[PDB]
Design a binder for this molecule. Structure first.
Ligand code: URC
Ligand code: URC
Lengths: 162, 162
């Protein structure tokens, strides 16, 4: 048994009138995601990056040269969505990783361009990030990791179809 | 394909020298967990509770009457771990949901006791939370949800064994 089985056993004792079985899968998902985040940010911290900072920089990098995206395009291609980007983009601009250039097709619009400093940083960070993620998943059998990847895609399909 | 497949395809184009396949399973895990959190907090908000507030209250509730736990016991039985509990416990005390009583076995120690207000709140919140989680998972086939639950337990086993 694990810590989520112990929690389900606590609810079998405290609220026997309720069926708390849906807590199982969701609890393990959220518990794994928090522990996974600690493993990832232990690598991101070597570059003075948070998780959202790496996400925004890697998203601009994935767009290809000249690594310039609109805020709408940037938001839609992030690995994980979140709240507004106003303050997060403002901090990345202060650190010199991104610059807000004026859209040539609309003067009253702005575009997000990865600077040459953020480009050199994100190219080094993505290399260490990939190797770090490989070490984390390395402890699982290949058949289990492939099944978890497929079952997570099924869960993601239902969440985004909502 | 999904949004994580599109990201993996972006890395196949931008860094063909790198193998970014470990990004797949971890990206879907973190993407699902964020979308799952939005579905959960859409129910927690009806009770003026955040995710960590529900976690701490449900943990004290799971301990059984008189719903009194030490900070070490409280931390070890939370669904998801996090940083320090100093400020989070201080806010719950201001809202009247918990009170810090003195340990009778150690005067220089404190215990966390769920008040009668937090007890009535968490008993109503856990009922709606369980029904909410059932509706979220209801869209998946039974065989897929059971396999995802087992594969997540395998992932959790490796993360906590680290
Ligand atoms: O291209 C990315 N790969 C990731 O693994 C990742 N993780 C994250 O948060 N953003 C991104 N972006
Ligand atoms: O008993 C709990 N069930 C949960 O589903 C849950 N989720 C959470 O964050 N804390 C808790 N506690």
């Amino acid at each position: 048994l694990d810590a989520v089985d112990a929690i389900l056993e606590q609810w079998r004792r405290e609220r026997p009138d309720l069926d708390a079985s849906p807590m199982g899968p969701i609890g393990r998902l959220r518990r794994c995601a928090v522990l996974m985040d600690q493993r990832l940010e232990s690598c991101f911290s070597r570059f003075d990056l948070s998780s959202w900072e790496f996400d925004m920089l890697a998203t601009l990098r994935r767009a290809g040269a000249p690594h310039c995206l609109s805020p709408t395009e940037l938001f839609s291609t992030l690995m994980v969505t979140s709240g507004t980007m106003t303050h997060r983009l403002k901090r990345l601009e202060t650190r010199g990783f991104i610059e807000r250039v004026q859209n040539e097709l609309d003067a009253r619009s702005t575009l997000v361009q990865l600077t040459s400093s953020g480009l050199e940083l994100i190219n080094r960070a993505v290399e260490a990030h990939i190797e770090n993620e490989r070490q984390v998943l390395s402890v699982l059998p290949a058949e289990v990791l492939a099944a978890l990847d497929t079952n997570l895609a099924a869960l993601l399909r239902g969440l985004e179809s909502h």
